[PDB]
Amino acid sequence: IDFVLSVAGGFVGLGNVWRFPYLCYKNGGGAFLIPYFIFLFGSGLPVFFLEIIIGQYTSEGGITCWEKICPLFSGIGYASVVIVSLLNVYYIVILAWATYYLFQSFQKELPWAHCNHSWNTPHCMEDTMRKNFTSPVIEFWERNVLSLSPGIDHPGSLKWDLALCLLLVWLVCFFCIWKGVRSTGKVVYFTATFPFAMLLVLLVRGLTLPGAGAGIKFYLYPDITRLEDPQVWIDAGTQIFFSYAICLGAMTSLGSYNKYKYNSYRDCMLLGCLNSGTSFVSGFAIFSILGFMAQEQGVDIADVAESGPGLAFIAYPKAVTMMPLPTFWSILFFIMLLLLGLDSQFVEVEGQITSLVDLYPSFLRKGYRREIFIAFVCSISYLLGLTMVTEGGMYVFQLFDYYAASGVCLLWVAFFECFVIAWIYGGDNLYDGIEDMIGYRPGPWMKYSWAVITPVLCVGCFIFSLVKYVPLTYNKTYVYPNWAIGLGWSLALSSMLCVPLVIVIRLCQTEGPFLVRVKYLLTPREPNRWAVEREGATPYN
Ligand SMILES: N=C(N)NCCS(=O)(=O)O
Ligand SMILES: N=C(N)NCCS(=O)(=O)O
Numbered sequence: 001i002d003f004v005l006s007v008a009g010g011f012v013g014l015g016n017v018w019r020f021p022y023l024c025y026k027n028g029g030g031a032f033l034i035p036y037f038i039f040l041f042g043s044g045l046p047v048f049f050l051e052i053i054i055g056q057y058t059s060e061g062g063i064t065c066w067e068k069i070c071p072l073f074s075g076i077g078y079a080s081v082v083i084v085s086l087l088n089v090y091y092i093v094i095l096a097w098a099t100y101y102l103f104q105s106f107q108k109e110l111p112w113a114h115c116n117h118s119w120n121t122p123h124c125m126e127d128t129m130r131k132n133f134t135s136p137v138i139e140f141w142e143r144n145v146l147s148l149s150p151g152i153d154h155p156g157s158l159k160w161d162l163a164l165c166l167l168l169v170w171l172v173c174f175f176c177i178w179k180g181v182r183s184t185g186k187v188v189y190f191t192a193t194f195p196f197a198m199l200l201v202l203l204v205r206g207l208t209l210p211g212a213g214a215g216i217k218f219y220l221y222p223d224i225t226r227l228e229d230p231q232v233w234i235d236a237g238t239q240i241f242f243s244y245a246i247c248l249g250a251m252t253s254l255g256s257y258n259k260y261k262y263n264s265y266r267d268c269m270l271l272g273c274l275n276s277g278t279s280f281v282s283g284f285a286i287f288s289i290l291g292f293m294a295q296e297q298g299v300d301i302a303d304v305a306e307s308g309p310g311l312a313f314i315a316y317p318k319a320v321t322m323m324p325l326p327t328f329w330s331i332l333f334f335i336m337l338l339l340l341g342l343d344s345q346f347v348e349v350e351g352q353i354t355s356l357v358d359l360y361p362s363f364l365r366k367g368y369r370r371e372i373f374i375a376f377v378c379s380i381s382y383l384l385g386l387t388m389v390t391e392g393g394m395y396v397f398q399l400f401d402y403y404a405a406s407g408v409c410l411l412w413v414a415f416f417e418c419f420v421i422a423w424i425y426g427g428d429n430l431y432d433g434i435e436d437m438i439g440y441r442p443g444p445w446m447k448y449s450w451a452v453i454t455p456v457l458c459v460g461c462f463i464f465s466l467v468k469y470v471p472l473t474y475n476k477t478y479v480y481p482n483w484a485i486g487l488g489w490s491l492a493l494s495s496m497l498c499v500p501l502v503i504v505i506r507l508c509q510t511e512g513p514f515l516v517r518v519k520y521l522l523t524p525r526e527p528n529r530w531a532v533e534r535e536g537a538t539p540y541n
């Protein structure tokens with residue numbers, strides 16, 4: 001009765017509603033979809049299935065699973081932990097923004113509708129009378145919500161309204177992890193069907209707006225010359241990794257909770273197509289609104305909103321103003337955004353705690369209270385997130401969004417996950433394990449993706465991005481300083497360096513000749529030991 005689908009109905013998140021439309025709009029629109037679908041069926045679903053299978057087979061979390069499959073490349077798991085840490089720093093900042101918008105909805109007139117407010121510049125023209133001039137919806141996002149600075153080197157002053165909204169979300173996250181609400185009960189029906197109900201209303205509203213056809217044509221019809229830019233492939237390929245929450249140890253930890261004899265192949269395909277289908281369908285909502293905005297303002301569709309983060313805060317808030325009782329719909333939309341983000345944030349932050357606690361089960365569990373450790377992790381993450389709340393903190397958010405938990409850092413982890421399984425552990429060796437679990441031998445799709453398709457895409461994007469290097473920009477105009485780019489690369493290299501560092505550490509610890517050390521550290525350590533004894537299973541090899 002699709003019980004697993006309802007339980008796993010939380011596949012839709014902020015990556016499908018917020019990040020996907022902004023990445024697609026930034027990369028020209030239709031040209032973004034081709035790499036998106038190439039990575040979807042070549043390295044998006046296969047890596048998701050690989051992580052789920054590793055979790056279900058080894059019956060271990062993010063790090064111990066690699067400790068069992070291949071000790072030498074154990075650092076992969078460590079890298080994932082680092083990645084998730086950075087994610088928890090910035091992924092919650094969006095929620096703060098949403099919370100701010102929520103507190104701005106509790107009034108008779110939505111503030112992003114007219115140009116008679118204090119923060120509005122003299123260049124504010126209402127879109128109705130539009131046909132220099134700036135839209136009131138954009139100015140509220142910039143002049144009021146963000147209070148944007150000239151650059152990242154100008155941090156300005158901390159925003160005391162967003163700081164209190166950021167703390168409010170962290171208190172909710174801390175309380176929902178300290179007590180572990182886990183959203184268990186009959187609220188699962190509401191928290192899984194309400195986002196689709198609101199996205200349907202936005203979709204119907206967006207489609208019926210005058211000029212939506214121009215926006216959809218921009219969204220669908222591709223620009224072939226745009227594909228020659230390497231950044232399109234990195235943005236689209238990593239977006240699959242972002243929405244699928246892979247290369248983080250979350251799916252491997254999730255996979256470990258599945259029974260050994262359980263057909264998780266059908267679930268990964270079902271959830272993968274539903275998660276990516278949600279992003280594609282939600283794209284018709286955003287871009288139909290953008291087509292309407294371009295139509296009335298007399299501007300090009302690519303120059304009517306922010307290319308960076310916040311497209312969902314300029315397009316969706318405007319669509320609300322056209323619905324009857326805009327106050328009612330504005331509240332519901334940002335309640336949906338809060339529900340989608342909080343559900344994802346609870347899983348990742350609590351997953352981060354589990355990985356760190358399991359690393360030191362004698363100290364963080366008995367000697368030092370795990371309850372205090374949850375407060376310590378949240379407190380440190382909150383302080384680091386205050387760098388994205390200052391007036392110049394929007395530029396810091398883009399650096400974290402572009403480099404941390406995205407870009408080459410995920411391609412680095414994805415490549416080594418597939419390389420170890422396909423070329424060291426063995427695709428046929430895993431297929432024998434998968435055959436026992438799911439009950440049948442899968443097709444050659446997974447085997448060829450782990451061995452050829454994924455490594456080629458991951459290493460191909462990395463090489464071509466370096467050969468044709470375009471520095472990160474914000475909203476197509478702002479040019480980051482050299483230190484900001486260097487700071488951004490340090491965020492990516494913080495986790496990328498974990499894979500080779502552990503290899504060096506493992507070799508030093510082991511004794512004997514160098515060749516003996518490598519061969520010893522490549523041998524799996526009983527990958528399915530628990531399976532044969534706790535349940536019914538065939539021992540590996
Ligand atoms: N677990 C899923 N499907 N996604 C996680 C990332 S996001 O969709 O919440 O951004
Ligand atoms: N924010 C969530 N839930 N997932 C992000 C996945 S990743 O981009 O860090 O791989």
Ligand SMILES: [Cl-]
Binds near residue numbers: 020275
């Ligand atoms: Cl997506």
